[PDB]
Write a protein that binds this ligand. Sequence first.
Ligand SMILES: *[C@@H]1O[C@H](CO)[C@@H](O[C@@H]2O[C@H](CO)[C@@H](O[C@@H]3O[C@H](CO[C@H]4O[C@H](CO[C@H]5O[C@H](CO)[C@@H](O)[C@H](O)[C@@H]5O)[C@@H](O)[C@H](O[C@H]5O[C@H](CO)[C@@H](O)[C@H](O)[C@@H]5O)[C@@H]4O)[C@@H](O)[C@H](O[C@H]4O[C@H](CO)[C@@H](O)[C@H](O)[C@@H]4O)[C@@H]3O)[C@H](O)[C@H]2NC(C)=O)[C@H](O)[C@H]1NC(C)=O
Ligand SMILES: *[C@@H]1O[C@H](CO)[C@@H](O[C@@H]2O[C@H](CO)[C@@H](O[C@@H]3O[C@H](CO[C@H]4O[C@H](CO[C@H]5O[C@H](CO)[C@@H](O)[C@H](O)[C@@H]5O)[C@@H](O)[C@H](O[C@H]5O[C@H](CO[C@H]6O[C@H](CO)[C@@H](O)[C@H](O)[C@@H]6O)[C@@H](O)[C@H](O)[C@@H]5O)[C@@H]4O)[C@@H](O)[C@H](O)[C@@H]3O)[C@H](O)[C@H]2NC(C)=O)[C@H](O)[C@H]1NC(C)=O
Ligand SMILES: *[C@@H]1O[C@H](CO)[C@@H](O[C@@H]2O[C@H](CO)[C@@H](O[C@@H]3O[C@H](CO[C@H]4O[C@H](CO[C@H]5O[C@H](CO)[C@@H](O)[C@H](O)[C@@H]5O)[C@@H](O)[C@H](O)[C@@H]4O)[C@@H](O)[C@H](O[C@H]4O[C@H](CO)[C@@H](O)[C@H](O)[C@@H]4O)[C@@H]3O)[C@H](O)[C@H]2NC(C)=O)[C@H](O)[C@H]1NC(C)=O
Ligand SMILES: *[C@@H]1O[C@H](CO)[C@@H](O[C@@H]2O[C@H](CO)[C@@H](O[C@@H]3O[C@H](CO[C@H]4O[C@H](CO)[C@@H](O)[C@H](O)[C@@H]4O)[C@@H](O)[C@H](O[C@H]4O[C@H](CO)[C@@H](O)[C@H](O)[C@@H]4O)[C@@H]3O)[C@H](O)[C@H]2NC(C)=O)[C@H](O)[C@H]1NC(C)=O
Ligand SMILES: *[C@@H]1O[C@H](CO)[C@@H](O[C@@H]2O[C@H](CO)[C@@H](O[C@@H]3O[C@H](CO[C@H]4O[C@H](CO[C@H]5O[C@H](CO)[C@@H](O)[C@H](O)[C@@H]5O)[C@@H](O)[C@H](O)[C@@H]4O)[C@@H](O)[C@H](O)[C@@H]3O)[C@H](O)[C@H]2NC(C)=O)[C@H](O)[C@H]1NC(C)=O
Ligand SMILES: *[C@@H]1O[C@H](CO)[C@@H](O[C@@H]2O[C@H](CO)[C@@H](O[C@@H]3O[C@H](CO[C@H]4O[C@H](CO[C@H]5O[C@H](CO)[C@@H](O)[C@H](O)[C@@H]5O)[C@@H](O)[C@H](O)[C@@H]4O)[C@@H](O)[C@H](O)[C@@H]3O)[C@H](O)[C@H]2NC(C)=O)[C@H](O)[C@H]1NC(C)=O
Ligand SMILES: *[C@@H]1O[C@H](CO)[C@@H](O[C@@H]2O[C@H](CO)[C@@H](O[C@@H]3O[C@H](CO[C@H]4O[C@H](CO[C@H]5O[C@H](CO)[C@@H](O)[C@H](O)[C@@H]5O)[C@@H](O)[C@H](O)[C@@H]4O)[C@@H](O)[C@H](O)[C@@H]3O)[C@H](O)[C@H]2NC(C)=O)[C@H](O)[C@H]1NC(C)=O
Ligand SMILES: *[C@@H]1O[C@H](CO)[C@@H](O[C@@H]2O[C@H](CO)[C@@H](O[C@@H]3O[C@H](CO)[C@@H](O)[C@H](O[C@H]4O[C@H](CO)[C@@H](O)[C@H](O)[C@@H]4O)[C@@H]3O)[C@H](O)[C@H]2NC(C)=O)[C@H](O)[C@H]1NC(C)=O
Ligand SMILES: *[C@@H]1O[C@H](CO)[C@@H](O[C@@H]2O[C@H](CO)[C@@H](O[C@@H]3O[C@H](CO[C@H]4O[C@H](CO)[C@@H](O)[C@H](O)[C@@H]4O)[C@@H](O)[C@H](O)[C@@H]3O)[C@H](O)[C@H]2NC(C)=O)[C@H](O)[C@H]1NC(C)=O
Ligand SMILES: *[C@@H]1O[C@H](CO)[C@@H](O[C@@H]2O[C@H](CO)[C@@H](O[C@@H]3O[C@H](CO)[C@@H](O)[C@H](O)[C@@H]3O)[C@H](O)[C@H]2NC(C)=O)[C@H](O)[C@H]1NC(C)=O
Ligand SMILES: *[C@@H]1O[C@H](CO)[C@@H](O)[C@H](O)[C@H]1NC(C)=O
Lengths: 139, 451, 40
Amino acid sequence: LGFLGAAGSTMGAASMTLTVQARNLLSGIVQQQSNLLRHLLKLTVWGIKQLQARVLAVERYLRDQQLLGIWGCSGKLICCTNVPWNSSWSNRNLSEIWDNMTWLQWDKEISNYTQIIYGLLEESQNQQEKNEQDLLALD
Amino acid sequence: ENLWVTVYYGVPVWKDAETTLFCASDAKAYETEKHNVWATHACVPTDPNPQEIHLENVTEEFNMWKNNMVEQMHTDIISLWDQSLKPCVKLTPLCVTLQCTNVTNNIRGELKNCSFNMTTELRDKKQKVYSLFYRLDVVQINSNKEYRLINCNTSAITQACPKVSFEPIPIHYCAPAGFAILKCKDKKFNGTGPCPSVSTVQCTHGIKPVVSTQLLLNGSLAEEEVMIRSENITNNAKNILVQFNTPVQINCTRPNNNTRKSIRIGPGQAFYATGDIIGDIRQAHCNVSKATWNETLGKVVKQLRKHFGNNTIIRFANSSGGDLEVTTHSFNCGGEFFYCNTSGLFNSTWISNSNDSITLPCRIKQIINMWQRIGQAMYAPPIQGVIRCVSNITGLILTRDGGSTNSTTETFRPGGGDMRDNWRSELYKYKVVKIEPLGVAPTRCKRRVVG
Amino acid sequence: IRGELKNCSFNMTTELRDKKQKVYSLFYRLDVVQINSNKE
Ligand SMILES: *[C@@H]1O[C@H](CO)[C@@H](O[C@@H]2O[C@H](CO)[C@@H](O[C@@H]3O[C@H](CO[C@H]4O[C@H](CO[C@H]5O[C@H](CO)[C@@H](O)[C@H](O)[C@@H]5O)[C@@H](O)[C@H](O[C@H]5O[C@H](CO)[C@@H](O)[C@H](O)[C@@H]5O)[C@@H]4O)[C@@H](O)[C@H](O[C@H]4O[C@H](CO)[C@@H](O)[C@H](O)[C@@H]4O)[C@@H]3O)[C@H](O)[C@H]2NC(C)=O)[C@H](O)[C@H]1NC(C)=O
Ligand SMILES: *[C@@H]1O[C@H](CO)[C@@H](O[C@@H]2O[C@H](CO)[C@@H](O[C@@H]3O[C@H](CO[C@H]4O[C@H](CO[C@H]5O[C@H](CO)[C@@H](O)[C@H](O)[C@@H]5O)[C@@H](O)[C@H](O[C@H]5O[C@H](CO[C@H]6O[C@H](CO)[C@@H](O)[C@H](O)[C@@H]6O)[C@@H](O)[C@H](O)[C@@H]5O)[C@@H]4O)[C@@H](O)[C@H](O)[C@@H]3O)[C@H](O)[C@H]2NC(C)=O)[C@H](O)[C@H]1NC(C)=O
Ligand SMILES: *[C@@H]1O[C@H](CO)[C@@H](O[C@@H]2O[C@H](CO)[C@@H](O[C@@H]3O[C@H](CO[C@H]4O[C@H](CO[C@H]5O[C@H](CO)[C@@H](O)[C@H](O)[C@@H]5O)[C@@H](O)[C@H](O)[C@@H]4O)[C@@H](O)[C@H](O[C@H]4O[C@H](CO)[C@@H](O)[C@H](O)[C@@H]4O)[C@@H]3O)[C@H](O)[C@H]2NC(C)=O)[C@H](O)[C@H]1NC(C)=O
Ligand SMILES: *[C@@H]1O[C@H](CO)[C@@H](O[C@@H]2O[C@H](CO)[C@@H](O[C@@H]3O[C@H](CO[C@H]4O[C@H](CO)[C@@H](O)[C@H](O)[C@@H]4O)[C@@H](O)[C@H](O[C@H]4O[C@H](CO)[C@@H](O)[C@H](O)[C@@H]4O)[C@@H]3O)[C@H](O)[C@H]2NC(C)=O)[C@H](O)[C@H]1NC(C)=O
Ligand SMILES: *[C@@H]1O[C@H](CO)[C@@H](O[C@@H]2O[C@H](CO)[C@@H](O[C@@H]3O[C@H](CO[C@H]4O[C@H](CO[C@H]5O[C@H](CO)[C@@H](O)[C@H](O)[C@@H]5O)[C@@H](O)[C@H](O)[C@@H]4O)[C@@H](O)[C@H](O)[C@@H]3O)[C@H](O)[C@H]2NC(C)=O)[C@H](O)[C@H]1NC(C)=O
Ligand SMILES: *[C@@H]1O[C@H](CO)[C@@H](O[C@@H]2O[C@H](CO)[C@@H](O[C@@H]3O[C@H](CO[C@H]4O[C@H](CO[C@H]5O[C@H](CO)[C@@H](O)[C@H](O)[C@@H]5O)[C@@H](O)[C@H](O)[C@@H]4O)[C@@H](O)[C@H](O)[C@@H]3O)[C@H](O)[C@H]2NC(C)=O)[C@H](O)[C@H]1NC(C)=O
Ligand SMILES: *[C@@H]1O[C@H](CO)[C@@H](O[C@@H]2O[C@H](CO)[C@@H](O[C@@H]3O[C@H](CO[C@H]4O[C@H](CO[C@H]5O[C@H](CO)[C@@H](O)[C@H](O)[C@@H]5O)[C@@H](O)[C@H](O)[C@@H]4O)[C@@H](O)[C@H](O)[C@@H]3O)[C@H](O)[C@H]2NC(C)=O)[C@H](O)[C@H]1NC(C)=O
Ligand SMILES: *[C@@H]1O[C@H](CO)[C@@H](O[C@@H]2O[C@H](CO)[C@@H](O[C@@H]3O[C@H](CO)[C@@H](O)[C@H](O[C@H]4O[C@H](CO)[C@@H](O)[C@H](O)[C@@H]4O)[C@@H]3O)[C@H](O)[C@H]2NC(C)=O)[C@H](O)[C@H]1NC(C)=O
Ligand SMILES: *[C@@H]1O[C@H](CO)[C@@H](O[C@@H]2O[C@H](CO)[C@@H](O[C@@H]3O[C@H](CO[C@H]4O[C@H](CO)[C@@H](O)[C@H](O)[C@@H]4O)[C@@H](O)[C@H](O)[C@@H]3O)[C@H](O)[C@H]2NC(C)=O)[C@H](O)[C@H]1NC(C)=O
Ligand SMILES: *[C@@H]1O[C@H](CO)[C@@H](O[C@@H]2O[C@H](CO)[C@@H](O[C@@H]3O[C@H](CO)[C@@H](O)[C@H](O)[C@@H]3O)[C@H](O)[C@H]2NC(C)=O)[C@H](O)[C@H]1NC(C)=O
Ligand SMILES: *[C@@H]1O[C@H](CO)[C@@H](O)[C@H](O)[C@H]1NC(C)=O
C-alpha cells in the first residue's frame, strides 16, 4: 500500500485499494497552514508560488469532482453506469484487461476517444435517468 | 455480453507535466542570526517525516536535461537574489575620479590605497576619506595614477545588506496537490533512460544552492563509482557533469585582517569600506589533499574510458580561453567572493592502465553581478575578521577538445560556463508528474434500472 | 540668413558623478520654452 503503491500492479489491485490515491489528492502536510507563527512583507517570491499552487490544487480537484456530480456518482468512489460498452473501443475480453494491463497502460489505450466516452456518460446516467422520474415520480 | 462502463475515482495514472513548486525547510537561522538571502524570513516548514514509496513494477523514463525543475530552480534564485538587494543602500555616489597608490613595495602590490571625494550626510558639504579596493575592480583612465570603478562604466551598483548570510542552506522542492515528484533510485543511471527503481516522494532531498563554478560543492553522490552524465556524449560541444562517489575536502581561508570603516553617504546609508589591514599581506589559498585528489581524478578517466574511444590518451588542460571570472573556481564564502586558479588541478595525465597537499592561489572580488546579468551589479562589503571555508567538493564540469576530426587523442578542460548545470547535478534523478484520478473501465455491472 | 527645431547645448552629468559633460541635442518646438542676445 501507500500513495500510488499499486501504480505498477495489475488493474485488479488498484481496484482493491484506490482510496490512498483519492485521499492524498486535495490536502497536504506540505501546505502546513502557511504562516511563520512561532521585516514585515509577505510579497516574497515564495508566497506567490505557494498561493498559485494552492489554487490549482482545488482548481484541479473541483474540475474533476464536478465531473463526478454530473454523472450521479458524487457520493461514492466507484459507481456503475447505464452506458453500454462499445466494441470499437477495445476488442479485448473481460478477464483479459483487468489482469494484464495495469491502468498506466490503460489510460494510453483510451486517451484517443476518452472525451467521447465522457460525453455519452452525462447522457445515459443523468440526462435520461434523472429525467425518468417524470413518469415514476408520481402517477 | 452487455458490457457496461464503470467509473473509478483515484486511479494511479500520471502524465508528464511541470507545475509551480515551493519551499520547505525546518528550524535553520532563527533568533541568533537570520536574514538568509535564500530562505527569506519564513519558508513553509518541512515535515519531520519524509515519505518515500518504492513504486513497484514501474519503469518510468526520466530526462535530466529536458527537465523543467532545474529551470524553475534557475529563475527562482535570480528573482530571490534580486529581492534581497532591492531594499538596501545604492552606491551611485561612488562614481568619482579615484586617485590611488600602491602599498608598501618599500622602494607584493595587488591592492591600492584610494582617496576620493564623496558626499556626506548633509547634501551641501563634501568629505574626503580613504578606502582600499582589490585589483581589477578598478581601472585607470588615461605621474599620479587615476582610477575608476569597473562597474560605473557599465551598469549601476548597490551594496549588499550588512547582515545577510550568503550561506547555502538546504531548500526542499515539493509538489502541489494532485502532483508527485518521481525519484530515480537506480544507482547507475547513464545519462537518462527508463529507470527500473522509481519512488513517488512528495518532497525532494535537501538541496543546497551552492553558487559554484567549474567544481561543485556540498552536493549529492550516488554509491557506485563516479557517474558521468552528458545530454549527448560525442557532441564535443555539450558540457559534462561529473558525480563522485566520495567527496574531496578542500578548505579555503583569507588571511587578511580587514577592518570595518563605515562612512555615511547621506542619511541612514553607510558604505562599508575596507579599513586598514593588520598583519603582513598574505594571498588567499585553497588546500586539496594531493593523495585524495589523485585517485578521484583516476576513477573518472576509468569511467570515461568506456565512453570515449575505449583505451586511448586522455589529457587534462587548464581552462582554455574565456574570461577570468568564469574560467576560475568562483564561489562565495562568508560574504567575500573567491576566484581560485584551477590550472594546478587539471595538468596531470595518466593513461595505459605530515602529508603533501596541493594549494591553489585565489584572488578576491568585491564587485559582482552573477549569472551574466548585465542589469545591476552589487558590492559585497568586506567581512570583518577571519575567513575560513571548509566544504566538500562533489561535482565537476568539463568541456571540449576543440574539433579534432577523429584522430589520436581526447582532452577535457574545465568550463563552468553556466549556473543552471550546477543544480542539474542535484536534480538528475527527479521529475514531477500530474496525477489524473479519473479512469473509466468496463465491467458487466449496471446500477438500478429506474431512478 | 523653415525653423521649427532647435540645436540645444546644455550641461549634463556623465558616468562619474564627479565630472560633467557638454553635448548637443535637437528638440522639437513647444517641448521647450524660453525663460526671460542668446536665447535660453
Ligand atoms: C558547504 O558546507 C560547509 C559546511 O556547512 C560550509 O561551511 C560553513 O560556512 C558557514 C558560513 O557560510 C560557517 O558559519 C559561519 O561561522 C563563522 C565562524 O564561527 C564558527 O565556529 C564557531 C566555533 O565555536 C566553537 O568554539 C567557540 C570558541 O572558539 C565556542 O565559543 C563555541 O561554543 C564552539 O565550541 C561556532 O561557534 C560558530 O557558530 C555558532 O556558535 C556561535 C557562538 O559560539 C554563534 O554566534 C553562531 O551564531 C552559531 O550559533 C561558527 O560555526 C561565524 O562567524 C559566521 O557568522 C556568525 O558570526 C558572525 C561573527 O560576527 C556574526 O556577525 C553573524 O551574525 C553570525 O552569527 C557563520 O556562523 C560554518 O562554520 C562553515 N562550516 C561549518 C564548520 O559548519 C560551506 O560554506 C558550504 N559551501 C559553500 C558553498 O561555501
Ligand atoms: C592609506 O592612505 C591613508 C591616507 O590618509 C593613510 O592614512 C595616513 O597614514 C599616514 C601615515 O604616515 C598618516 O600620517 C601621519 O600623520 C600624523 C599626524 O600629523 C602630525 O604629525 C606630523 C609629523 O610629521 C610627519 O612627517 C615627518 C617627516 O619626517 C616625520 O618625521 C614625522 O614622524 C611625521 O610622520 C606633523 O607634521 C603634523 O603637524 C603639526 O604637529 C607637529 C607636531 O610635531 C611633529 O612634527 C615635528 C616637526 O615639526 C616633529 O619634531 C615631531 O616629532 C612630530 O612629528 C608640529 O611640529 C607641526 O608644526 C604641526 O603643528 C601633525 O602633528 C603623524 O603623527 C604620523 O607620524 C603620520 O605622519 C596620515 O595622517 C593618515 N591619514 C589621515 C587620515 O590623516 C593610511 O595609512 C594608508 N593605508 C594604510 C596602510 O593604513
Ligand atoms: C585583527 O585585528 C584586530 C584589531 O586589532 C584584532 O582584534 C584584537 O586583537 C588583539 C590581539 O590579538 C586582541 O587581544 C587583546 O585584547 C585585550 C583585551 O582588550 C579588550 O577588552 C578590554 C577590557 O580590558 C582589557 O584591557 C584593559 C586595558 O584597557 C586591561 O586593564 C584589562 O585587564 C583587560 O586586559 C577592552 O578595554 C578593549 O577595548 C578590548 O575590547 C587588549 O587589552 C589587548 O591590547 C593589547 O594589544 C593591542 C593591540 O591589539 C595594543 O594596542 C594594546 O596597547 C595592548 O598591548 C589586545 O587587544 C583583542 O581582543 C582583539 N579585539 C579587539 C576588538 O581589539 C584581531 O585579533 C586581529 N587578528 C589577529 C590575527 O589577531
Ligand atoms: C563531507 O562529507 C563527509 C562524509 O559524509 C561529511 O561528514 C558527515 O557529515 C554528515 C552530515 O553533515 C553526517 O551525516 C549524517 O549524520 C547523521 C546524524 O544522525 C541523526 O540525526 C540527524 C539530525 O536530526 C539527522 O539528520 C540524521 O538523519 C540522523 O537521524 C547520521 O545519523 C547519518 O547516518 C546514517 O543515516 C542517515 C539517515 O537518513 C542516512 O542518510 C546516512 O546515509 C546514514 O546511513 C549521517 O552520518 C555524518 O555523520 C558525517 N560523517 C560521515 C562519515 O558521513 C561532511 O559533513 C561533509 N561536508 C559537507 C558540508 O558536505
Ligand atoms: C488516435 O487516432 C489518431 C488518428 O486520428 C492516431 O494518429 C496517428 O498517429 C500516428 C503516430 O503519431 C501517425 O503516424 C505518423 O507517422 C509519420 C511518420 O511515418 C508515417 O508514414 C510512414 C509512411 O507513410 C506512408 O503511409 C502512411 C500510412 O498511413 C500514409 O499516411 C502516408 O501518407 C504515406 O503514404 C508509415 O510507414 C509510418 O507507419 C507512419 O504512418 C509522421 O510523419 C506523422 O506526423 C505521424 O506521426 C498517424 O499518421 C496518425 N493517424 C493517421 C491515420 O494519420 C493516433 O495514433 C491514435 N492514438 C491511439 C494510441 O489510439
Ligand atoms: C576633492 O575636492 C577638491 C575640491 O573640489 C578637488 O580639488 C582639489 O583639492 C585639493 C585639496 O585636496 C587642492 O590642492 C590644494 O590647493 C591648496 C591651495 O590651492 C590654491 O593655490 C594652489 C597653488 O598653491 C599655492 O598657494 C597655496 C595656498 O595655500 C600655497 O600653500 C602653495 O605653496 C602655493 O603658493 C592652486 O593650484 C589652486 O588652484 C588654488 O589657487 C594648497 O594650499 C594645498 O597644498 C593643495 O595643493 C587642489 O588644488 C584641488 N584642485 C585640483 C586641481 O585637483 C579634489 O580633486 C577632490 N578629490 C581629490 C582627487 O583629491
Ligand atoms: C556648462 O558648465 C559651465 C561651467 O559650470 C557653465 O559656465 C560657462 O562655461 C563657459 C565655457 O563653456 C565659459 O566660457 C569660457 O570662458 C573662458 C575663460 O573664462 C574666464 O575668463 C573669461 C573672460 O575671458 C578672458 O580670458 C580668457 C581666458 O582664456 C580669454 O581667452 C579671453 O580672450 C578673455 O581675455 C571670464 O568671463 C570668465 O569668468 C573666466 O574668468 C574663455 O577662455 C572661453 O572662451 C569661454 O568664454 C563661461 O565663462 C562659463 N560661465 C558662464 C558665465 O556661463 C556653462 O554655462 C554650462 N553650460 C552652458 C550653458 O554652456
Ligand atoms: C604540470 O605538472 C608538472 C609536474 O608534474 C610541472 O612540471 C614541473 O614544474 C615545476 C614548477 O615549474 C618544476 O619545478 C622547478 O624545477 C626547476 C628546475 O627544473 C627549479 O629551478 C624550480 O625551483 C624554483 O621554483 C620553486 C617553485 O616553483 C621554488 O620552490 C624554488 O626555491 C626555486 O625558486 C622548481 O623546483 C619541475 O621541475 C617541473 N617538472 C617536474 C617533473 O616536476 C608543470 O610545470 C605543470 N604545468 C602546469 C602549467 O601546471
Ligand atoms: C545511455 O544508455 C542508453 C541505452 O543503451 C543509450 O541509448 C542508446 O542510444 C543509441 C544511440 O543514440 C541508440 O541507437 C543506437 O544506434 C547505433 C547506430 O546504429 C546505426 O549505425 C550502426 C553502425 O554505426 C549500424 O550497425 C546500425 O545498423 C545503424 O545503421 C547502433 O549501432 C546501436 O546498436 C543502437 O541501435 C540505442 O537504441 C539507445 N538504446 C536504448 C533504446 O536505450 C544512451 O545513448 C546512453 N547515453 C546517454 C547519454 O543516455
Ligand atoms: C582542512 O583543514 C583541516 C584543519 O582545519 C585539516 O583537517 C585535518 O587533517 C588532518 C590530516 O592528517 C587530520 O589529521 C588526522 O585526523 C584523523 C581523523 O581523520 C585523526 O585520527 C588523527 O589523529 C589526525 O588528527 C586532522 O584530524 C584534520 N582535522 C579535522 C578536525 O578535520 C584538513 O586536512 C584540511 N584539508 C586538507 C586539504 O587536507
Ligand atoms: C461504436 O460507436 C461508433 C461511433 O458511433 C460506431 O462507429 C461503431 O459502429 C459503434 N460500435 C458498436 C456497434 O458499438
